[PDB]
Amino acid sequence: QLTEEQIAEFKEAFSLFDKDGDGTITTKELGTVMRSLGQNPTEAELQDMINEVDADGNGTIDFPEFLTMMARKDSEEEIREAFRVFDKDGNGYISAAELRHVMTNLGELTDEEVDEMIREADIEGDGQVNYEEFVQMMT
Amino acid sequence: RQIPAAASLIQTAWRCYAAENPDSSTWKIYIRISQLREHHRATIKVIRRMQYFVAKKKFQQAR
Ligand SMILES: [Ca+2]
Ligand SMILES: [Ca+2]
Numbered sequence: 244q245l246t247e248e249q250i251a252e253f254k255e256a257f258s259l260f261d262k263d264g265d266g267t268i269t270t271k272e273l274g275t276v277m278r279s280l281g282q283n284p285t286e287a288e289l290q291d292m293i294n295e296v297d298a299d300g301n302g303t304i305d306f307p308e309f310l311t312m313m314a315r316k317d318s319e320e321e322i323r324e325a326f327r328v329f330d331k332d333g334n335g336y337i338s339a340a341e342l343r344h345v346m347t348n349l350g351e352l353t354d355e356e357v358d359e360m361i362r363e364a365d366i367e368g369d370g371q372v373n374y375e376e377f378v379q380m381m382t
Numbered sequence: 383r384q385i386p387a388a389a390s391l392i393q394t395a396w397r398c399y400a401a402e403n404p405d406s407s408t409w410k411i412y413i414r415i416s417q418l419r420e421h422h423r424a425t426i427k428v429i430r431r432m433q434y435f436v437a438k439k440k441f442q443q444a445r
Pocket of ligand 2: 297298299300301302303304305308
């Protein structure tokens with residue numbers, strides 16, 4: 244279940260996005276929050292975000308939809324198969340160099356963040372990033 | 383191809399898992415908020431989570 248205190252906690256979070264206290268979260272309102280925390284998202288990104296959480300398709304997120312998403316948990320398999328995209332020839336391992344380059348230059352991550360990543364996975368140098376280990380750690 | 387979709391899912395997942403460390407490197411990135419406070423961390427987590435799900439859909443479209 245969710246707890247009485249938990250539901251309160253989520254209501255707080257929801258209000259931090261819902262600037263106009265009108266019971267829903269717009270793209271503009273989410274963009275505002277994100278820009279407030281120093282990000283420069285495209286309205287494309289904001290729409291994609293809202294669509295992942297918008298159930299009834301009204302274009303805004305209501306509180307039900309919000310606590311549905313906060314309560315969302317197969318994802319192990321998805322993340323494992325993501326690492327496979329970079330697995331030279333189905334090793335099971337990824338070179339830490341390859342991991343770092345992907346993690347920094349492709350996609351979304353900082354050198355510090357990736358240092359944490361590699362430090363949480365490598366078994367000395369040898370056993371270069373066994374991604375099965377990553378996937379299990381995250382789940 | 384699915385190289386950027388792949389990467390954004392691993393990255394997205396990790397910043398989620400890492401945010402749950404009250405003391406991760408992941409936190410440093412937010413360089414416009416002087417000292418990170420409660421509500422800051424709340425909105426952050428909310429957003430990382432939301433990005434997770436987006437990356438999870440985009441990768442499902444690529445798989
Ligand atoms: Ca609103
Ligand atoms: Ca809605």
